[PDB]
Structures are given as structure tokens and as C-alpha cells.
Amino acid sequence: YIAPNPRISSITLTQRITTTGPFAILTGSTPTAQQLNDVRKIYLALMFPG
């Protein structure tokens, strides 16, 4: 699994430091093992349409 360039979030999503929002808070989070397994479940569900 490949993550995008972090600078994309830096210049657009956290452009100003004095303002806080939901996306800003979820920007600084690290997944655990169970969340990685959930992402794998997402992808397996996507690979079979019906």
C-alpha cells in the first residue's frame, strides 16, 4: 500500500495554523493493525463488485 506525498496535505489542507477543523485533526493520525485489516477488507470488497 502506497501513501501519497505529504506535501499535498501541507499546502492545501493545513494552509493556516490558527484554524482547526476535522480534516486537520484526522491528518495527524497513524493506523493500527486492526485498521490496516479493515482497509484490506475495504479493498477485497471493492475487488468483487456484487
Binding site: 486537520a24 485533526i25 491528518t27 495527524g28 493520525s29 497513524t30
Partner: peptide
């Protein structure tokens, strides 16, 4: 631990 926004989770126990 790099983002400041992760610290408030620790603050809230």
C-alpha cells in the same frame, strides 16, 4: 509522534 494534533488524544487519557 510528529503531529501536534495527536497530542490531545493523550491529553484526554
Amino acid at each position: 509522534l510528529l503531529s501536534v494534533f495527536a497530542l490531545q488524544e493523550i491529553m484526554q487519557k
